[PDB]
A paper describes a structure:
KorA was crystallized in the presence of the operator OA. In contrast to the free protein, several crystal forms of the complex were obtained. Structures from two of these were determined. Both show the DBDs of the protein symmetrically placed about the DNA axis. In contrast, the orientation of the CTD differs in the two crystal structures. However, only one CTD could be modelled, although all eight DBDs are clearly visible. There is only weak, partial electron density for the other three CTDs, presumably as they are highly disordered. In contrast to most proteins containing a helix-turn-helix motif, that bind to one face of the DNA; the two DBDs of KorA straddle the DNA, with helix 4 of the two subunits binding to opposite faces of the major groove. In addition, the recognition helix of KorA, helix 4, is longer than in classical helix-turn-helix proteins and so the CTD is held away from the operator DNA and it has no interactions with the DBDs, making it flexible even in the presence of DNA. Given the highly flexible structure of the protein, MD simulations were used to explore the conformations of the free and bound protein in solution. Figure 5 shows an overlay of the conformers sampled for the KorA–DNA complex, over 100 ns of simulation; the complex remains very flexible with the CTD exploring a wider range of orientations than the two observed in the crystal structures.
Author numbering:
A (entry chain A): 2 to 96
B (entry chain B): 2 to 97
DNA sequence: CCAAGTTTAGCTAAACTTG
DNA sequence: CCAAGTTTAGCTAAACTTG
């Protein structure tokens, strides 16, 4: 279901520390739409591996694909600092 | 360094998905102060595998709250605000 | 039902951080 | 420089979830 255009894929793999196999896997799956089973079959890899491989590149895209000048952060914080962050995301969701 | 008593360890392991070897390993370095290196030698393991096992028990205890006015927050912010949030988490990980 | 995809403890390699 | 510890991609297993 989840897929990436050619250019979104190129963005996601920009400087991403990842082997060439992982790149090929995600390319066939996210861009060319091939099932993950094919790379499991053809590479002799378990279903887990291929899925983790595609996941990295997808997560990479999600770590980008944010308005430039922004970044996603997550943490457990005190009630006060938790409150401030709540507001900041609201103000961020105005621009 | 980072160590635990028996009550904290029995609290750490409480509810954690974890085999028996990982409990052993963590008990040795967190509770009994034994180095991680000796556990690699006896169990025939790389340094990393032993380090992952310790971390899992240590993290579970650090994730046993304890001020729950605290809350898990996730947000998409500009870098200047993101930096502060990253700084805040880093304050929180020292204070605990 | 069947097939495919997800998830996570546990491992190694290996490069990196600490003291 | 070394020793001990940390980190993380990549892999399995196996139980779980989606289509």
């Amino acid at each position: 279901k989840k897929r990436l255009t050619e250019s979104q894929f190129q963005e996601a793999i920009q400087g991403l520390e990842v082997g060439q196999q992982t790149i090929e896997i995600a390319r066939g799956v996210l861009v060319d739409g091939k099932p993950q089973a094919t790379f499991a079959t053809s590479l002799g890899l378990t279903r887990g591996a291929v899925s983790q491989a595609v996941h990295r590149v997808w997560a990479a895209f999600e770590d980008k694909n944010l308005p430039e000048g922004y970044a996603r952060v997550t943490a457990v914080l005190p009630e006060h600092q938790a409150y401030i962050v709540r507001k900041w995301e609201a103000d961020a969701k105005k621009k």
